[PDB]
Design a protein around this ligand. Structure first.
Ligand SMILES: N=C(N)NCCCNC(=O)[C@H](Cc1ccccc1)NC(=O)c1ccc2[nH]c(=O)cc(O)c2c1
Length: 236
């Protein structure tokens, strides 16, 4: 997260850190608890991941230093990638992780509500992007989870910024004209959370962008409300 600040312990309880064990253990992607056995993440995260066996999901984490060999984690039983996905930039950048065991909800780890089809005309003004990613383009994974308030840009405005791409209705963009605040390497799969009527909604999944926090380049997120039927179908 560029131009962000440290989160407080448990202020983003749906936020998970997805690790890989191959060749040595490292953070791979962010993700969100959407159910007892369900993590919503991005599809691009699993490029070259042959088996869900190398994956470890960690919940209730503030700092990466909390993860040692003796730390409990959730095994992955299945990676469900959307069947129309090819790559991040063309959309359908969504994946569900079926956990081996269920998550015991507490103040440190709880699910985030998915937006309803009626909320398609809601004007979200309290949107945050969270992750352990890069604080600059050339950096490293951060110990402490960062947060940044980012305003939603219209699909019409985002399209003018990405003239060589098609920004579809299944995408949502967020950013400042002048830049300085955005997701960066290591934040993908993660939530774009928006507070509406005292309730937090998973509005977007960190997907792609041209660099990180550049002027006139909003970050591009998967628009979750467009996948609530696919989420229902695959979670059955
Ligand atoms: N402006 C925007 N909104 N951009 C959004 C998209 C940002 N892209 C990402 O997050 C990529 C995607 C991606 C995710 C997984 C694999 C390839 C690409 N992540 C990484 O490269 C990434 C991820 C984990 C890492 N683990 C480490 O230990 C050291 C790393 O260097 C490191 C870097």
């Amino acid at each position: 997260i560029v131009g962000g600040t440290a989160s407080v312990r448990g202020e983003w309880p749906w936020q998970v850190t997805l690790h890989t064990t191959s060749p040595t253990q490292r953070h791979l992607c962010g993700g969100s608890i959407i159910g007892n056995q369900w993590i919503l993440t991005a599809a691009h995260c699993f490029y070259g991941v042959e088996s869900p066996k190398i994956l470890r999901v960690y919940s209730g984490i503030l700092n990466q230093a909390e993860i040692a060999e003796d730390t409990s984690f959730f095994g992955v039983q299945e990676i469900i990638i959307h069947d129309q996905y090819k790559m991040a930039e063309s959309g359908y950048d969504i994946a569900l992780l079926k956990l081996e065991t269920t998550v015991n909800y507490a103040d440190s780890q709880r699910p985030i509500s998915l937006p309803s089809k009626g909320d398609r005309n809601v004007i979200y003004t309290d949107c945050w992007v969270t992750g352990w990613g890069y604080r600059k383009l050339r950096d490293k994974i951060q110990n402490t989870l960062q947060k940044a308030k980012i305003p939603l840009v219209t699909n019409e405005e985002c399209q003018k910024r990405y003239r060589g791409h098609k920004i579809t209705h299944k995408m949502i963009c967020a950013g400042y004209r002048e830049g300085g605040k955005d997701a960066c390497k290591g934040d993908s799969g993660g939530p774009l959370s928006c507070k509406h009527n005292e309730v937090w909604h998973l509005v977007g999944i960190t997907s792609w962008g041209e660099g990180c926090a550049q002027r006139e380049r909003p970050g591009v997120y998967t628009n979750v409300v467009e996948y609530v039927d696919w989420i229902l179908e695959k979670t059955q």
